[PDB]
């Protein structure tokens, strides 16, 4: 188990049609950053690297992801001294 690292959570594994469940908003517990994903890796799949709060991390994207796609990481935003929240990675097609 790797608590101080990033998972394959990208698509937002939701039993629903499409969900993410964003939180920690307003009080700066949440975090937004971009992730640069190639179009072939966005459509087919592949791991891409994201510079986050913690540092360089490993983010495997879904085989349908699109420009603007919010890859929700839950409890992976700002730290507990700041107030623990969640972090989103906005897919940029390149």
Swiss-Prot record:
GO cellular component, one term: cytoplasm
Subcellular localization: Cytoplasm
Keywords tagged on the record: Chaperone, Cytoplasm, DNA replication, Stress response
Molecular functions per Gene Ontology: unfolded protein binding
Superkingdom of the source species: Bacteria
Keyword field contains Cytoplasm: yes
Predominant location: cytoplasm
Listed GO biological process terms: chaperone cofactor-dependent protein refolding; DNA replication; protein refolding
Function: Does not influence ATP binding or hydrolysis nor ADP release. Exerts influence on the interaction of DnaK with substrates; in the presence of DafA, DnaJ inhibits substrate binding, and substrate already bound to DnaK is displaced by DnaJ and DafA.
Quaternary structure annotation from Swiss-Prot or TrEMBL: Forms a heterononamer with DnaJ and DafA in the resting state. Three copies of each protein are present in the complex.
UniProt family annotation: Belongs to the DnaJ family.
Protein name in UniProt: Chaperone protein DnaJ 2
Source organism (scientific name): Thermus thermophilus (strain ATCC 27634 / DSM 579 / HB8)
Residues of the full protein shown: 191 to 256 of 280
């Amino acid at each position: 188990m790797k608590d101080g690292a990033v998972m394959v959570m990208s698509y937002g594994n939701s039993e629903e049609d499409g969900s993410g469940g964003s939180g920690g908003s307003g009080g700066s517990q949440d975090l937004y950053a971009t992730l640069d994903v190639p179009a072939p890796i966005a459509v087919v799949g592949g791991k891409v690297r994201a510079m986050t709060l913690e540092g360089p991390v490993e983010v495997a994207v879904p085989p349908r992801t699109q420009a603007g796609r919010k890859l929700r990481l839950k409890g992976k935003g700002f730290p507990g001294p700041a107030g623990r929240g969640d972090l989103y990675l906005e897919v940029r097609i390149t």
